[model samples]
Target: VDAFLGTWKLVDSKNVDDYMKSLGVGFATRQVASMTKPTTIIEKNGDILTLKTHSTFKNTEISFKLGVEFDETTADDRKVKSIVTLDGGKLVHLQKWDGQETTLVRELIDGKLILTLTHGTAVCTRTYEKEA
Candidate 1:
């Protein structure tokens, strides 16, 4: 996945607060998290790919093989069962925690990395552009 192997800088977000609310994130964390513009870095080594987010407020990363499940501790300290798979050139990410499940599909469309995050009835779209 050539498009997935790049540094991406987040440029826009929509309804991200609601998505965090659905995940049971609290007020203080949400305030800071919502304020931060994180850079996403994805690197591939052999059959494994690592996806990470970096920001002044927080940073998190995971290395995994496609379709394999792993223990993932999220930024909010949620212990989640996580898996990522490829659908064509798109990366489909799933995380489950405390009876709540969320899906974040990462796709490079029209030269933008469009991440669609969904939990319950709340959905957030975070747009990013490839960086040098």
Candidate 2:
């Protein structure tokens, strides 16, 4: 959703260190990640759009035209590998990773935004603060 756009601070993250370590994220990355304030940006072009996630550690960017299926690789953000699609209103993320396939849920909650990244046993969360 367009409302999901803008910068965000990670209010809470579950198993983030473990996830990062599993992905072989370096010390620098881990340090940056712990204190990272990510900017999740959405740029729309007609019905097509690009979802870009930026942080001090690294940037995760993906492009997908609405309703079209596209495979996304997680060379940088190894925790995420998904085929994103717009299912009616919500931006449905069908994640296909090594361990477990998952569905990422995104929505605005309590005037703040929440992103739930999950697998069978692993789950991570990130909260947002809309830039003024």
Candidate 3:
């Protein structure tokens, strides 16, 4: 948790729009989402952690304990079951929505946060720099 405690600003993204489309996101929302940069802030307090994703289009947050499953509402307003865990040097989240599973992995690399998201065959990768 300490390794991931920081505010991260998005610097690059790949195939995120396509990934959202694969999740059944509509055209108009995807268009706004494709251009919106996001800042992710992670906070940890003992066994509880808070993850916040801030963007111009929408903001969402989730609070959970490691290795525990909780109900979460996505930025797209979908309710899902989510579990977060720390694996290796990465913080990982497994989300189940609409009977589909999606994985999100966050790791620190070269002073940056690398977020890799996968849903079925679609994948999106985003890189973020720690806020100074």
Candidate 4:
């Protein structure tokens, strides 16, 4: 959690359109998502962590503790049960939505945050640079 502290701005993304399509997002929404650059703010206090994703189209936030399960509504409007854990120096998030599973992995490497979102076979990778 300490490794991910501070604000990070999206710098690059790959396969995000397909990833959003896999979640049944509409074409217009996917187009907007593909073009949006989001800033993520992560704050950790004791055992709880809060993650805020801000974009012009939409903003979402989640507060959770490691290894604990909580309900969340994703940016694409999917209701999920989310659990997060630390594994191999990365934050691994498992989300169960309507019997389907999605996994997100967040890793800090070389002063950038590499976020991987996997839903079924569609995978999206987004890179974020640390804010100055």
Candidate 5:
């Protein structure tokens, strides 16, 4: 459960446009977001966990219990209902807004953190690394 306790640096991001586009983001904003590198920090406090993503353009932090839904303002500025659950060692993050829904699955593979985001048919994969 504490496997995610580390600061991860984004090493690569592929097809981010498709992921953001599926969220109905504006063209200009998608371009800017796709090019920015972000650092992700994961921390835990008793039963609550927090994830913080930092980048040059923006920063976002979400703290929640394992299986409770909470109001979340996404990085794209969308107000949504968000929940996170643990499944087979992977953190499954789900968000719903404006009649749309998306899922982001984060798992560790070969010591690297891999985040797979999906919305409808659009998918984006981002890889992150933590210092050994």
Candidate 6:
């Protein structure tokens, strides 16, 4: 669980268009979002993990447990459900907020942790390097 402890910088993304569309964001917003800097801070203690999502424009946090269910909200403040678990020593975060989705799984890859996010036709992934 400590594998996810620390802050992560947002680096590139896939299917960002779909994510923006779902949030009813305009083209300008989407364009800006693509280049905007975002960071996630994950803190784990015992079986609980707290995820803090931050950006220049907004900030949000979510708390959950391994294999347990919890509530979440989109950047636009839409309520959604999320679940987190461990998969082969990798932290796997499962989100099923919009229409039964399991689109995101976070794990360490190539010396960095990658978040392969997906939803419907959109698949936006985020990778992060460990902070010193």
Alpha-carbon RMSD of each model = 1.0, 3.2, 0.9, 0.7, 1.1, 2.2
Q: Which has the greatest TM-score?
A: 4
Q: What is the C-alpha lDDT profile of model 3 across 38-73, one tens digit per residue?
A: 999999888999999998889988899999999998
- Model 1 Cα shift for residue 2 (angstroms): 1.9
lDDT of 6 by residue, 5-123 (tens): 89888766677778667556788778777777788899977777788988887788888878887877767666778777788886776666546664567888886878876656666
Give residue 50's lDDT in candidate 1 (0 to 100). Answer: 90
The Cα error of candidate 4 at residue 129, in Å, is 0.3
Every model's TM-score: 0.96, 0.72, 0.96, 0.97, 0.95, 0.82
Give me the overall lDDT of model 4.
0.94
Q: How far is candidate 2 from the true structure (C-alpha RMSD, Å)?
A: 3.2
Runs off by more than 4 Å, candidate 2: 21-31, 75-81, 86-89, 97-99
lDDT of 1 by residue, 1-132 (tens): 767898999899999999999888999999998889999999999999998899999889899999999999988898999999989788999999878799999998899999999999999999999999
Q: Write the per-residue lDDT of candidate 4 for residues 1-132, one digit (tens) a residue.
A: 798989999999999998998889999998899899999999998999999999999999999999999999999888899999999999999999778999999998898999999998999999999996
Per-candidate local distance difference test = 0.92, 0.67, 0.91, 0.94, 0.92, 0.75
Task: Give the number of the best model, judged by lDDT.
Answer: 4
Question: Candidate 3 at 70: error in angstroms?
Answer: 0.3
Residues 1-132 of candidate 2 have per-residue lDDT tens digits of 676555655566666666566556687867767776677777777776777877666777788765556777663555555566655455668866666676676777776767766655667776766766
lDDT by residue for model 5 over 74-94, one digit each (tens)? 888889999999999999999
Task: Look at candidate 4 and give me any clashing residue pairs.
Answer: none
**Could you tell me which 10 consecutive residues in candidate 3 have the lowest summed lDDT?**
72-81
- As a whole number from 0 to 100, the lDDT of residue 94 in candidate 2 is 81
Q: CA shift at 116, candidate 6, in angstroms?
A: 0.9
- In order of TM-score, best first, we have 4, 3, 1, 5, 6, 2
